[PDB]
Write an enzyme that holds these catalytic residues in place. Structure first.
Site, short mmCIF file in Angstrom:
data_model
loop_
_atom_site.label_atom_id
_atom_site.label_comp_id
_atom_site.label_asym_id
_atom_site.label_seq_id
_atom_site.Cartn_x
_atom_site.Cartn_y
_atom_site.Cartn_z
CE1 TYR A 1 -24.66 -18.95 4.89
CE2 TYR A 1 -25.78 -18.60 7.20
CZ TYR A 1 -25.77 -18.88 5.73
OH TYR A 1 -26.45 -20.15 5.12
CG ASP B 1 -1.98 1.09 1.08
OD1 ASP B 1 -3.03 1.23 0.68
OD2 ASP B 1 -2.07 2.38 1.52
CG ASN C 1 -21.79 -8.25 18.42
OD1 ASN C 1 -22.24 -8.12 18.78
ND2 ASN C 1 -21.05 -6.90 19.42
CD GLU D 1 -25.43 -19.66 17.15
OE1 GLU D 1 -26.57 -20.03 15.45
OE2 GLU D 1 -26.26 -20.19 18.08
CE1 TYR E 1 -11.73 -31.14 8.25
CE2 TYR E 1 -12.39 -30.82 5.56
CZ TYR E 1 -12.13 -31.18 6.92
OH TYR E 1 -13.44 -29.44 6.41
CG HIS F 1 -8.52 -26.53 10.05
ND1 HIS F 1 -9.36 -27.92 10.03
CD2 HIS F 1 -10.15 -26.06 9.30
CE1 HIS F 1 -10.86 -27.69 9.83
NE2 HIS F 1 -11.04 -26.37 9.34
CG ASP G 1 -16.71 -17.67 14.38
OD1 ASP G 1 -16.87 -16.60 12.75
OD2 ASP G 1 -18.29 -17.24 14.77
CD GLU H 1 -14.29 -28.38 9.78
OE1 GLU H 1 -15.10 -27.53 10.10
OE2 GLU H 1 -13.09 -28.27 9.18
CG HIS I 1 -17.88 -29.26 6.79
ND1 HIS I 1 -17.09 -29.50 6.33
CD2 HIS I 1 -16.85 -28.01 7.04
CE1 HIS I 1 -15.76 -29.24 5.60
NE2 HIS I 1 -16.10 -27.93 6.43
CD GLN J 1 -4.20 7.64 5.88
OE1 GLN J 1 -5.02 7.52 6.43
NE2 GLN J 1 -3.53 8.62 5.56
CG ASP K 1 -19.19 -32.17 4.68
OD1 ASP K 1 -18.12 -31.68 4.24
OD2 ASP K 1 -19.40 -32.09 5.71
CG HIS L 1 -13.17 -22.93 11.45
ND1 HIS L 1 -14.23 -24.13 11.98
CD2 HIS L 1 -12.92 -23.89 10.02
CE1 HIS L 1 -14.36 -25.34 10.80
NE2 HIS L 1 -13.32 -25.47 10.44
CD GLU L 2 -10.95 -21.85 7.12
OE1 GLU L 2 -10.37 -23.01 7.12
OE2 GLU L 2 -12.28 -22.06 7.01
#
Ligand SMILES: [Ca+2]
Ligand SMILES: [Ca+2]
Ligand SMILES: [Ca+2]
Ligand SMILES: [Ca+2]
Ligand SMILES: [Fe+3]
Length: 316
Positions: A193, A57, A183, A187, A157, A146, A138, A166, A231, A61, A226, A142-143
């Site tokens: 989402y 950049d 917050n 969930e 997996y 892993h 989250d 998972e 999942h 900024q 899956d 989560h990633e």
């Protein structure tokens, strides 16, 4: 890149302003030298070749809308690193301060994010099912978890081990969300989402059945989709973890909650000391009980709550 450490400012996916750690060398780069061997964020420029270009950049900024996902990916990875370090005494995902890399603007309208065995990757979403996925702490946590699992238990997996893998990522992604006090809830992915729909999320740990995932072993998915429902069936473990933390009565079995902190301590120990690549749910239960035993004593309430929780979801 070799340069001077500095601090820039920008706005994230949700429009919030934050400061981020940058490196100055002609350009300002999204490279944070303050954490382990560094956190680096790259622009995949809507392509699928990885990692892309290290983010550069001109003025330090980052208020352009194209910047947003990079800001969050970069910032949230730092938070997650901090969580692991501060809380579990683990230095990066490998325990040895490995550099953390993420690419954003991966592909076009890609409604997913993932760990590819080397780095994190985030889509921008199609703008309807999702918005840029790195806007959810989250999801980021989560990633990165892993990666942690890959370096430790190495859970394969697929089938039960994969569902465990998972659940681990959802559990720690949620613990990180509470850590940062952003917050927090039980969930998964609520913040990025279905922008149009308020109140939903991708998955629920408190009530997996809300979205059609199993909340009891008797309801597990046994087919092939899956990867054998990694999942889907994670919901059973997620529910167990929620009960251990929060308590409740589920299918007539009562669990006294022991809190988030202890939940994290017990799962982290299981993960790092007792789980193996092929561990199944029943083995996970043994592991969690042993960990709690290690930590709190076999006659502890902690051990007792771990037992009840698994009994409640039908895992023997
Ligand atoms: Ca700029
Ligand atoms: Ca939340
Ligand atoms: Ca959440
Ligand atoms: Ca929504
Ligand atoms: Fe995952």
């Amino acid at each position: 890149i070799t340069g001077t450490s500095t601090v820039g400012v920008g706005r994230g996916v949700l429009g919030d302003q934050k400061n981020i750690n940058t490196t100055y060398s002609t350009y300002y780069y999204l490279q944070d030298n303050t954490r382990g061997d560094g956190i680096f964020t790259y622009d995949a420029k809507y392509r699928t070749t990885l990692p892309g270009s290290l983010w550069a950049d001109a003025d330090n900024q980052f208020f352009a809308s194209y910047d947003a996902p990079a800001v969050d990916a970069h910032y949230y990875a730092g938070v997650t690193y901090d969580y692991y370090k501060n809380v579990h005494n683990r230095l990066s995902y490998d325990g040895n301060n490995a550099a953390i890399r993420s690419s954003v603007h991966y592909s076009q309208g890609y409604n997913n994010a993932f760990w590819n065995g080397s780095e994190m990757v985030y889509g921008d979403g199609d703008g309807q099912t999702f918005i840029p996925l790195s806007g959810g702490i989250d999801v980021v946590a989560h990633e990165l978890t892993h990666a942690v699992t890959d370096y430790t238990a190495g859970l394969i997996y697929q089938n039960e081990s994969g569902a465990i893998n998972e659940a681990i990522s959802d559990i720690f992604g949620t613990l990180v969300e509470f850590y940062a006090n952003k917050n927090p809830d039980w969930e998964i992915g609520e913040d990025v989402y279905t922008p149009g729909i308020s109140g939903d999320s991708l998955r629920s740990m408190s009530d997996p059945a809300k979205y059609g995932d199993p909340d009891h072993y008797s309801k597990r998915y046994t087919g092939t989709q899956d990867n054998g429902g990694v999942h889907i069936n994670s919901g059973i473990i997620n529910k167990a973890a929620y009960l251990i933390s929060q308590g409740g009565t589920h299918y007539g079995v009562s669990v006294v909650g022991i809190g988030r902190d202890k939940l994290g301590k017990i799962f982290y120990r299981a993960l790092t000391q007792y789980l193996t690549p092929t561990s199944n749910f029943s083995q996970l239960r043994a592991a969690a009980v042993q960990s709690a035993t290690d930590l709190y004593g076999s006659t502890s309430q902690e051990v007792a709550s771990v037992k009840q929780a698994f009994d409640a979801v039908g895992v023997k």
